[PDB]
Every structure is written in C-alpha cells, then in structure tokens.
Design a protein around this ligand. Structure first.
Ligand SMILES: OC[C@H]1O[C@H](O[C@H]2[C@H](O)[C@@H](O)[C@@H](O[C@H]3[C@H](O)[C@@H](O)[C@@H](O[C@H]4[C@H](O)[C@@H](O)[C@@H](O[C@H]5[C@H](O)[C@@H](O)[C@@H](O[C@H]6[C@H](O)[C@@H](O)[C@@H](O[C@H]7[C@H](O)[C@@H](O)[C@@H](O)O[C@@H]7CO)O[C@@H]6CO)O[C@@H]5CO)O[C@@H]4CO)O[C@@H]3CO)O[C@@H]2CO)[C@H](O)[C@@H](O)[C@@H]1O
Length: 637
C-alpha cells in the first residue's frame, strides 16, 4: 500500500485516455458506435471488438439467417465495422422485436453464434435453453419528465429486487414496482433505492450476480422503457435510485454471455487460470486491457445516461482486488469513480468490501479509491453472534458500542440481503423462531417470546440507525420483520417461486402484529429526516453499563437511551447530557403503535440539572422500562 503509487498510476492511464481518446467523456461513450445502430439515412452501422476472429458477420431474421451475406470490414486494433446500405423501398432493415446474432469465424474454421457484448435487450423464449438477441427500436422512446432530486443530506437506502417485490410466486414487473412498491418506499421515509439484479443475468437464482449481457436491463421484469419510467417516477417522488454494478466477474455462458466472444479465452477476460474465478465458476476481466476499460467505463456511462441512475454499488470489490493486490482492478475502480463524480459531483458510489482496504473510500487526490461510502459489514455479524451464541444477560454493551462506532463514511444495516435467504436466519427469525408462525396474530396471546422479539427488532434497528454510520440500509421486507425466508426458483426446489416473493400485505392486515414493526420503521426514518443524526458527527457515548445493560449517547443534539436488560426497569435513572433545560420524548419504542405496553407519558417534561454525570456537565432523571429505547429532544423553555 503506497498512495503515491495508486495516484501516479491512475494519473497516467487518465492522461492516456486524454491523448488517445478524447478524454474520459468521449472514451465512455463507446455504446454510441459499438453494437448495432440504425442511422438517419436508413442504413445500419455495426461495430465490435473481436481481436481473435478471422471474420465477423451479422445474421438474423432480417436476412433469413444467411450467416455470411453481411461481412464486417476489419479495422486496426482487432475492431470490425459493418454498414448495411439503406433499403431501395426505404423500409427498416432490422425490424424492432426481431432476432439477431454476430457470426465469428475462427482460424480453425469454427462458426460461432454470439450475442453482441453491447446488446441493449435479450429475451429467453418460453422454455428455450438460451437467450435470443432482440433488436430494440421502439416507435416511441421514453421521454424523461422529471429532474434528479437534490442530493440527500443523509442516505436512507431501501435495498430492492424487482422480481420478488409482489406477493405472487412469479417474476414481478418494472410496472408493478413503479405503481405499488415506490409509494410504500416513500411512505416509510426512505429517500434512496438500491436496485439489485437489473443488469442481465440468465440465472435468476444468482440474485443478479451472474451477468450475461452487461448493457441489457433484465427483460424478465419488462422493457427498457419501463425501467426508465421506474427511475423517472422515483425522481418525481424525490427518491434517488442507485444500481448494483457487477463488474467483478462474468457468467461463463458463451451462447448468450460474454465468455469466449471471439472464440478465445482472452477477449474481455484473462487467458488461462488467471481469468477464471474457481469458487464462482466465472470469468475474470482483463482490467489492464484498453478495450475492457472502454467496455466497463461505457457501461457505467450507459446506466447514468440511458437509465438516469443517481449512482452505484460496486459489488465484489474484495474479489476484484485480490487475485497481493490487483493494481489494474483498483485503477479501473478509480477511473469509474472519477467518471461518475466528474459527470455529476452529486452522484454516489458505494463499495461492497469485507477486506477494509486502506483509503478505498477516500478522495483519489489523496491516493484513495474514490468511493463515497463502504458498507459497515461488521454490524450484521455482531447481531448474529449475540443472538446465536449469547444469553441476553451476557451481552456486552461495550462490544455493541465498539462494533457500531468503529471507522471513512459507511452505510449501517442490521441485516443483509444474504441473511434473508434460505439456509440462513433473518433478525425476526433469530428473535421469534417458530412463534413467528403462531403468535404474530393480534388474536393470539402476546407471549414473552413475541414480546421480546418485537422489542429487540426495534431496538437493534434503532441503535444501528442512530450510532452505526453515515447512512442506513434496509432490505425489502425486513422493515416489518418479514416471516419465512427468500428462495429463488432453481434445480434444488424444482423451480419453486413460493419463497421468491414479498408478503407486503402483512402490514395492511390490522389483525397481525407486523404493522407494529412497520410503524416503528416509518417513524424512525421520518425522525431522522427531521433531525439528521446520520449526517451529524459521531455520537458522544456517556454510558455503556455492563450491569444495568444501558447504552446512552447524544447525536445531533438528541439523547438516545437503550435498556437492553431482560428484566430490570429503571426509575429515576441518571443520564448525562451536554444541554441544560427542558427535554421531551420524540421517540419511544414502548408506544402502543409499535407494540409496546404504553408505560410512558410523552407529555412529561424532563429537566436537565447541573450535576456532573458520566463526563457530561448536566444530567436528567428518566423512567426506562426493560427492552425500551427512547429519543429525547431539547426544547425551548
Ligand atoms: O507522421 C509523423 C508521425 O509519424 C509517426 O506516427 C504515426 C503513427 O505511426 C501512425 O500509426 C498514426 O497513428 C495515429 C493513429 O492513426 C490514430 O488512430 C491514433 O491512435 C490511437 C487510437 O485512436 C486509440 O484508440 C488508441 O488505440 C488503442 C486501441 O483502441 C485499443 O483497442 C488497443 O488496441 C489493442 C487491441 O485491443 C488488441 O486486441 C491488439 O490488437 C491486435 C488484434 O487483436 C489483431 O487481430 C491484429 O489486428 O493485430 C492487432 C495489433 O497487434 O493490440 C492493440 C494494441 O497494439 O490499444 C491501442 C493503444 O495503442 O491509441 C492509439 C495511439 O494513440 O493516434 C495515432 C498517433 O498517436 O499516425 C501517426 C502520425 O500521424 C511517429 O510515431 C510520430 O512521432 C510522427 O510525428
């Protein structure tokens, strides 16, 4: 790790992009010439990079699948271009909705049929083994009607998957998400959507991590225009949309994927074993290769320009960095971040990194990776440890406080999307187990295990939200403690969609207790919008009492008190504060609307006195019941 090196290297490649291409703007507009394009003159212009092809051709429905009638002309640097002249009758050469294929001929004599790396749209017809390359030329394009929202003060991310966003056991649509799921997200107080599994993946059960077509918005959920309408509608509501970018590896599919494009093992990827990820059975990009930079950077630009995304989450950053560290992978990520922020400084980039790479989330100008945030991955693990291995009486308050406050800006989350999956437990499941199925009805008794589960689900989320980071993340359903698990159709379940859905109706059912966990989430995010603790400096922790099981801190002027004690309810408990005067309850997890016992009267005025307590100048006395969290705001006398 030499920061002077990381910059000098980046600075050089960027300088070359300027001398060789016309700067990173021009360089990242590769999607404008590569692929298949209909010209204003009625002709068709095509361009590809196939360095190890003897010949390249265009075939499809349009030419009665004659493989060699349209040969591309070879250019320098292993690139090929084709211009089919316009029709005499002045009609479309390649009709919209029709099938296409690139024909690659090898030195040996193999005749290979490929989908262009640059393909905009791909569809799997009924029960076909492979995806077909569908030419996209609609009568009307989607015109974006709304402007990008003002950059949020603090991010409150709602991690979403479009397919599973309905109560039905089927792939839900972009249209369904736009009409039914966007208003729910807005209502909860979330100001950002992390859109998962958008980049085309042939294997649905890969959760969007096995990419086949990099420039293609998954056909599965609908047309490219319906995704544009989705993003535009989110903007109409003041919600920013970020995309999950998988540039770490590629699916090894060759018929309908990026693998073996020009017939060799070294096109967009590394030759031999270096180019194969053994654990994932995937291909690995040759980040040193100029054309891989054009491809990957024109992809970043594509999602910014075509679909108007407000930023990205770069997945598999750890795997990219360690093949010792891959300098090329890292210089690619620096150029990607440089591009995103040069085009729009308000744009956000997040890194999915477990390693904790020094300066990954710091400015490039200081030898950093250029990322705005990293995910605070230690937080979900600490909650798992405590619920799996420790009795409530044995939870260390100092260890909770340490894990949450360790730090570079990070995104805090109580549980990941991976924890929602089959053969893993959600926080709601770790807390209530089999009782989740029995006593989540208002009509059944409020058992001590349902009572404990509800109280702790709220508290774990609130301490993660208030103390854990500079941003917050919640995966679809976990805001109301969604039951069961998530599982995608695959071999191992005989293609079942029974768990490939989200039961959102559970919160609308007044005869169920999910409404309580949902109400808490809505009010937690709305209170954050009002006071901005996520944007505030790190909290001042006055108390992390091992005996009493009390965590007390101040962030953005608010006073946060947590009683994790399984049985003791403290009266006249002294909490230190930096502010004198009157204090009022702004949030109480024991309120009835959240599934509490209503033990506290909110109309009570708490008066700060001049009594040094826990390194705080003033202190106030409070009633904090067992498994209750409180937020107190200082008010004008
Ligand atoms: O007249 C006085 C003047 O004379 C000299 O300079 C001459 C040059 O000698 C002459 O060639 C020309 O150079 C221009 C050139 O015409 C311009 O186009 C431009 O070149 C840029 C280019 O536009 C950029 O794109 C960039 O090129 C990349 C390329 O895009 C990228 O794909 C990659 O290419 C590699 C490829 O991907 C690989 O697959 C492989 O290619 C293989 C094929 O796979 C294989 O199938 C087969 O076809 O062979 C190929 C080659 O082995 O390798 C490729 C790389 O080798 O990388 C390149 C990066 O190089 O950059 C170029 C360069 O900037 O600009 C140049 C000028 O810089 O005109 C000038 C004069 O006008 C003399 O040198 C000078 O001092 C005198 O003043």
């Amino acid at each position: 790790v030499d920061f002077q090196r990381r910059y000098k290297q980046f600075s050089q490649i960027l300088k070359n992009i300027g001398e060789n291409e016309g700067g990173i703007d021009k360089f990242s507009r590769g999607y404008e010439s590569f692929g298949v394009h209909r010209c204003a003159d009625g002709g068709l212009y095509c361009k590809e990079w196939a360095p190890g092809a003897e010949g390249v051709f265009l075939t499809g429905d349009f030419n009665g699948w004659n493989p060699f009638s349209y040969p591309y002309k070879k250019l320098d640097y292993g690139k090929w271009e084709l211009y089919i002249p316009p029709k005499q009758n002045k009609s479309v050469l390649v009709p919209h909705g029709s099938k296409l294929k690139v024909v690659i001929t090898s030195k040996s004599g193999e005749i290979l049929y490929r989908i262009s790396p640059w393909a905009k749209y791909v569809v799997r017809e009924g029960d076909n083994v492979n995806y077909d390359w569908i030419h996209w030329d609609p009568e009307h394009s989607y015109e974006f009607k709304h402007s990008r929202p003002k950059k949020p003060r603090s991010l409150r991310i709602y991690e979403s998957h479009v397919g599973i966003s309905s109560h039905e056991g089927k792939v839900a649509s972009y249209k369904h998400f736009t009409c039914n799921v966007l208003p729910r997200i807005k209502g909860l107080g979330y100001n950002c959507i992390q859109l998962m599994a958008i980049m085309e993946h042939a294997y649905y059960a890969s959760f969007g991590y096995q990419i086949t077509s990099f420039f293609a918005a998954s056909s599965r959920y609908g047309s490219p225009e319906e995704l544009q309408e989705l993003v535009d509608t989110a903007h109409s509501m003041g919600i920013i949309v970020l995309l999950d970018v998988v540039h770490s590896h590629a699916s090894k599919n060759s018929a309908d994927g990026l693998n073996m494009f020009d017939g060799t093992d070294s096109c967009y990827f590394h030759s031999g074993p270096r180019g194969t990820h053994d654990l994932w059975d995937s291909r690995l990009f040759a980040y040193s290769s100029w054309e891989v930079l054009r491809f990957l950077l024109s992809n970043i630009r594509w999602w910014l320009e075509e679909y108007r995304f407000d930023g990205f989450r770069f997945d598999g950053v750890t795997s990219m960095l360690y093949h010792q560290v891959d300098e090329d992978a890292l210089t690619y990520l620096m150029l990607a971040n440089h591009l995103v922020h040069t085009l729009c400084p308000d744009s956000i980039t997040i890194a999915e990194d477990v390693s904790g790479m020094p300066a990954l989330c710091s400015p490039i100008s200081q030898g950093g990776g250029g990322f705005d945030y990293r995910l605070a991955m230690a937080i979900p693990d600490k909650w798992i440890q405590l619920l799996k291995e420790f009795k409530d009486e044995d939870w260390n308050m100092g260890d909770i406080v340490y894990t949450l406050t360790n730090r570079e800006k990070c995104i805090a989350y109580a549980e990941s999307h991976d924890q929602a999956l089959v053969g893993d437990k959600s926080l709601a499941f770790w807390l209530m187990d089999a009782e989740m199925y029995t006593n989540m009805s208002v009509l059944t008794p409020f058992t001590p295990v349902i009572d404990r589960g509800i109280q702790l689900h709220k508290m774990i989320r609130l301490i993660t939200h208030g103390l854990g980071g500079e941003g917050y993340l919640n995966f679809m359903g976990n805001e109301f403690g969604h039951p069961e698990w998530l599982d995608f159709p695959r071999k191992g379940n005989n293609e079942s969609y029974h768990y490939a859905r989200r039961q959102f109706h559970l919160t609308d059912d007044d005869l169920l207790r999910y409404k309580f966990l949902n109400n808490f989430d809505r009010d937690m995010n709305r209170l954050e919008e009002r006071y901005g603790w996520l944007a505030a400096p790190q909290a001042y922790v006055s108390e992390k009492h091992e005996g009493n099981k009390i965590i007390a801190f101040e962030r953005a002027g608010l006073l946060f008190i947590f009683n994790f004690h399984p049985s003791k309810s403290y009266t006249d408990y002294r909490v230190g504060t930096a502010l004198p005067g009157k204090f009022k309850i702004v949030l109480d997890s024991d309120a009835a609307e959240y599934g509490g016992h209503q033990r506290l009267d909110h109309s009570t005025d708490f008066f700060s006195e001049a009594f040094e307590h826990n390194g705080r100048p003033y202190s106030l006395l409070v009633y904090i019941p067992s498994r209750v969290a409180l937020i107190l705001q200082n008010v004008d006398l």
